[PDB]
Amino acid sequence: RLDELRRIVSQLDIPVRQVMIEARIVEANVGYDKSLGVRWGGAYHKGNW
Amino acid sequence: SGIGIGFITDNIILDLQLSAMEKTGNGEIVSQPKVVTSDKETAKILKG
User: Fold this and answer.
1) Phi-psi category of B40—alpha, beta or left, where left has phi over 0 and alpha has psi -120 to 50?
2) Do B1 and A49 touch (CB under 8 A)?
3) Do B19 and B3 meet the contact criterion of CB atoms below 8 Å apart?
4) What is the DSSP string of A1-49?
5) Pairing status of strand A47-48 against strand B2-8
6) Can you tell me the distance from the alpha carbon of B42 to that of B40, in angstroms, rounded to the nearest whole number?
7) Is residue A46 left, alpha or beta, with left meaning phi > 0 and alpha meaning psi from -120 to 50?
8) Per-residue CA distances from A32 to A12, A15, A44, B20, B25 (Å)
């Protein structure tokens, strides 16, 4: 039993394997906004849009 | 928005205005979240 337990000990005393985990977050924002306000105002003859 | 005024004052005061507004708006929103999940397991994606 001593010897068998020794073998189990050999199996158990194994280095735990570390891994480097690299998770990367990428955010991309593209924004194009165009606004045109066209104005025609005359109070001389009261025509104004 | 739009106005047209016609006015008489000397003989009679008659002010006649036509006020018109026309608005058209089209908005499209397309949002797509993609999640990779193991079989029979719950996974979540959250943005907000």
Assistant:
1) left
2) yes
3) yes
4) -HHHHHHHHHHHS---------------------------EETTTTEE-
5) unpaired
6) 7
7) left
8) 61, 55, 39, 30, 17
* Interchain CB distance below 8 Å, A46 and B1: no
In the PDB record, what is the listed experimental method? Answer: cryo-EM
Contact at 8 Å (CB) between B17 and B5? Answer: yes
Q: Which tokens sit at B7?
A: 């006015």
Cα B3 from Cα A40, distance rounded (Å): 11
Q: What residues of B are in contact with residue A45 (Cβ under 8 Å)?
A: 5
Per-residue DSSP letter, B10: S
Instruction: State both tokens at A40.
Output: 């025609």
Experimental resolution (Å): 4.3
